[PDB]
Ligand SMILES: NCc1ccc(-c2cccc(F)c2)c(Cl)c1
Ligand SMILES: NCc1ccc(-c2cccc(F)c2)c(Cl)c1
Ligand SMILES: NCc1ccc(-c2cccc(F)c2)c(Cl)c1
Ligand SMILES: NCc1ccc(-c2cccc(F)c2)c(Cl)c1
Ligand SMILES: NCc1ccc(-c2cccc(F)c2)c(Cl)c1
């Protein structure tokens with residue numbers, strides 16, 4: 001069977017912290033007053049929640065209210081516990097309150113408001129310096145949450161709120177986040193298709209924080225190469241073939257052989273043989289202003305099949321790509 005794996009960092013955070021920290025099922029929710037909030041506009045709806053812009057009438061402050069749907073409702077304690085554990089962390093969305101929505105009969109999470117700039121608008125105008133700057137801010141959030149024994153598991157552009165005017169960034173939607181326990185087998189049906197790490201795509205369940213580092217690398221490749229998404233799979237199987245057309249099939253086979261993983265036999269008819277491509281292949285006259293030798297070297301160290309080989313968030317912050325960023 002599969003060879004076991006452990007994170008190379010923050011391995012034993014959850015064992016040396018008290019049980020009340022990670023045992024989210026034993027957590028007693030403190031309920032706030034639903035009457036303090038006035039819903040103003042529905043921002044959106046997903047399969048797990050409905051999100052609104054609201055006003056806290058006890059201080060006139062704008063807030064965001066996330067009304068959880070019943071599917072999400074069953075696992076709210078994990079999300080609430082994670083949010084409380086991470087509250088005050090750098091660039092982590094702040095949970096302000098938890099109320100019972102009288103219509104949905106489900107919990108509603110109230111968050112600080114972030115005046116999010118449109119994804120298309122921001123994607124199109126970010127300079128080389130702004131990419132580096134915001135990547136560094138995302139790394140602060142990821143090293144903080146990994147240091148706290150938590151993996152996000154859904155890093156993607158829609159989960160990163162940016163108020164470009166105030167250069168404020170927040171990592172949101174901790175609904176898929178989980179506590180890392182060494183040797184635990186996790187569900188591989190996490191993260192959005194284009195951001196899924198190879199470990200999910202080959203059904204390797206003993207993954208860790210390094211999954212977030214793959215997803216971060218996919219975001220970086222899209223922004224510096226102006227190719228959205230970078231790995232554009234039609235389904236989860238084609239997602240792996242898209243990765244293999246860039247990183248190559250030999251390094252893929254080295255990875256699955258290292259962990260004694262067998263690919264789904266359906267790959268025989270779609271995977272083929274592909275050499276590893278040099279990152280410079282993706283440079284052209286329309287993205288050259290966002291690329292540098294430091295960007296390519298940094299991307300190379302995130303987008304690695306072997307989850308144990310990827311840079312950690314703290315090592316990533318040490319990289320020359322961020323030397324230009326004012327700290
Ligand atoms: N308070 C507005 C509202 C009302 C109902 C629901 C809801 C409840 C049960 C199932 C479901 F799919 C949605 C939500 Cl999330 C928000
Ligand atoms: N451009 C209007 C807008 C305003 C707020 C939000 C928002 C949603 C959830 C959490 C959050 F911190 C902010 C979005 Cl997505 C769009
Ligand atoms: N939710 C809008 C959004 C979130 C994040 C980013 C982003 C992603 C990678 C690097 C970076 F500097 C910024 C963009 Cl462009 C838009
Ligand atoms: N108003 C456009 C819009 C719609 C949806 C999302 C979205 C999608 C998935 C997860 C998430 F946290 C947010 C965003 Cl960021 C903006
Ligand atoms: N994919 C062909 C390609 C095209 C141009 C460049 C390039 C762009 C700007 C400066 C520079 F020193 C080189 C590279 Cl690296 C690769």
Ligand SMILES: NCc1ccc(-c2cccc(F)c2)c(Cl)c1
Pocket residue numbers: 280283288289290291292293294296297
């Ligand atoms: N921003 C202009 C630019 C773009 C790309 C490169 C480049 C060229 C070859 C390899 C490499 F890793 C990066 C340079 Cl030197 C300058």
